[PDB]
Amino acid sequence: SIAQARKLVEQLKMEANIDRIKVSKAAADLMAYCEAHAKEDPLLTPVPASENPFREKKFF
Template sequence: EKELLRMEVEQLKKEVKNPRAPISKTGKEIKDYVEAQAENDPLLQGISEDKNPFKEKGTCMIN
């Protein structure tokens, strides 16, 4: 138990050194980044048929 507490204290010492920023600032930065990248996002824009690796190559017919 003592070793676990020591590890936890060491982890907290590392985490306290991380720079902090208010969510009002970081949230706006994330929103701006997502909006700027939206035109390159295939989930929003779709994939053209010639670049789609999952497009069916042909059909198979059984007579």
């Protein structure tokens, strides 16, 4: 019991003092990346049948 608790305490102390960043920067870096790959998403922006290998396209 004692040794396991001490190891847990050591892990917690190691993970407590890690550095972080305000929510604002993470939010910005999330929405900026989401915008950056707009045209590359065939679900967010449905792609025409010319790029729908399931409907009608090269399948050989």
